[PDB]
Amino acid sequence: DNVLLSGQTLHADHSLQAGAYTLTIQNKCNLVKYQNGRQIWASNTDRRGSGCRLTLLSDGNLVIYDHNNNDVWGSACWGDNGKYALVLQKDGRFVIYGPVLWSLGPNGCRR
Amino acid sequence: DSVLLSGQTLYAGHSLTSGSYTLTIQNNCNLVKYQHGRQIWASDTDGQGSQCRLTLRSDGNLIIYDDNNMVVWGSDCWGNNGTYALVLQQDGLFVIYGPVLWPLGLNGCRS
């Protein structure tokens, strides 16, 4: 419940949860991180659209999407096109992990 | 948890978990992925030491150490130094995601 692989989505009001941090993409577009329930950070895009959703792009970029797919917000950072993983940690940082480095099977090791 | 990040370590008996998948680094030193009871893959390092632990290097390398702190097994796939994340996914694959890409510090992007 605390990970979100690239191509996946956190629908409206859905959240990631790790330990005591809850990162929620609210329906009205503001991504909010709580700690035990009290807000502590937020993308400050409340009202910027509605039926909002958070998604991790295949190039590691993180973007909040409108229900009309407008790009409300975004981590504005992209690396090689591949597959990434956003993980909310038990310390509150929600991090995006570079493209895939290893995996079992035939090529599965970008070096 | 379904994530192990660089610097963390799973000791014997420990496992990541996700839905029906479970990746356990066993007392007998064998790193084994299961699906509901059934075994699907292993490093085949059973009885290759006891008290083994699975840790993820700072360079993304996945390694098994034993009783005497000797590398019993590894993935031998590493990249630049920083933080990595090994995540056991809902499709049952365990992937190790490249170095950190965006919250570099506050809001930093490795280019």
Ligand SMILES: *[C@@H]1O[C@H](CO)[C@@H](O)[C@H](O)[C@H]1NC(C)=O
């Ligand atoms: C990879 O290296 C430095 C020293 O080699 C270490 O302090 C750091 O934890 C590492 N990764 C990062 C960026 O934390």
